[PDB]
Design a protein around this ligand. Structure first.
Ligand SMILES: Nc1nc2c(ncn2CCN(/C=C/P(=O)(O)O)CCOCP(=O)(O)O)c(=O)[nH]1
Ligand SMILES: Nc1nc2c(ncn2CCN(/C=C/P(=O)(O)O)CCOCP(=O)(O)O)c(=O)[nH]1
Ligand SMILES: [Mg+2]
Ligand SMILES: [Mg+2]
Ligand SMILES: [Mg+2]
Ligand SMILES: [Mg+2]
Lengths: 183, 175
């Protein structure tokens, strides 16, 4: 494997970008009837921190290529003026769906014109409640991944690819954390 | 010029990335003596929202290519004993970074330095020098690469000078 800390690369940066261009064309078509414009009427991108920052940076630039002007806002996942605006919530990963369920419900209170979700990685086998994202860049099985914004204990977000974390990484670290707690 | 809304393109995405690779090599060299490691001792990247999110996304990936492991925190415009690098898309009067740096310094990081995408050295209202600067801009209003005009145009891939008619008409529209 390309990375000492991973056992498999699931999606390279290039694969993700290719899939994101496909998604951006769908978004561009779906919102074509909305007369989106910079300043007057942008698509409001609501980015769920921390991990979504990389996906958000890449996706708004690709959305711009496809003619979809945006305005970004940032929400903190640890905590979990769109009235009359179209809103697209962006999450790095969707797993139990508990986070996005709450984020969407919260935003709905402010009466946006519409609200949809776009996720880079969907783990469809991880749900604790029924939830479907309108737009999904890639599906992964129930394995633990890092990269493209996704962390293990705040590290590895900067890895360019989505990779399966090698178990000795969290076994080693977990022991060190537990050793520090007893010392 | 490629963009309807811009008078000229100052720095293309490719030119910014080329400069960022140069800066990342200096950062890798400057922090080599710190024994940075994922989990145990990452370089703490403090990203000043909102506009720095694009620069931060690109820059942490480049730093990773150069062997500099990071963790990110976001500040809106657990660090004791850690090295901190503050990232800002643009530095002008320096009043934002002065306040950010001084507030972080109260948590006693091991060190604190600043990295900005765009420095406007002629805009200072207090003296301030960033340790790393990707590019310099003179007395012009730019958008793109995270930088906005009234929250739009952050998604433009290049740093561009906004056409005056854009903010003339919008300013008039905000009646
Ligand atoms: N790095 C990583 N994180 C994973 C994974 N699966 C769930 N998570 C936790 C993601 N979290 C829960 C999503 P859910 O739909 O279950 O509410 C959201 C992101 O966590 C907050 P942050 O972006 O790390 O600051 C994974 O495979 N890799
Ligand atoms: N888009 C754009 N913004 C500019 C420019 N010059 C100063 N600014 C103000 C940006 N900043 C002031 C930096 P200072 O050192 O003066 O404290 C703050 C950035 O604005 C906050 P946000 O990123 O837009 O949420 C410019 O040329 N283009
Ligand atoms: Mg997240
Ligand atoms: Mg996480
Ligand atoms: Mg900023
Ligand atoms: Mg601004």
């Amino acid at each position: 494997c390309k990375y000492d800390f991973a056992t498999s690369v699931l999606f390279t940066e290039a694969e993700l970008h290719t899939r994101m261009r496909g998604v951006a064309q769908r978004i561009a078509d779906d919102y074509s009837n909305c007369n989106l414009k910079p300043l007057e009427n942008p698509l409001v991108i609501v980015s769920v921190l921390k991990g979504s920052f990389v996906f958000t940076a890449d996706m708004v630039r690709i959305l711009g290529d496809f003619g979809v002007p945006t305005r970004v806002e940032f929400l903190r996942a640890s905590s979990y003026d769109i009235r009359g605006k179209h809103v697209l919530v962006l999450e790095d990963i969707l797993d139990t769906a508990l986070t996005l369920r709450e984020v969407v419900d919260s935003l709905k209170k402010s009466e946006p014109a519409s609200i949809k979700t776009l996720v880079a990685i969907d783990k469809p086998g991880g749900r604790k409640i029924p939830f479907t994202a309108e737009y999904v860049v890639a599906d992964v099985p129930n394995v633990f991944v890092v990269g493209y914004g996704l962390d293990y204990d705040q590290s590895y977000r900067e890895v360019r690819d989505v990779v399966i974390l090698k178990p000795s990484v969290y076994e080693t670290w977990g022991k060190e954390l537990e050793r520090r707690k007893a010392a």
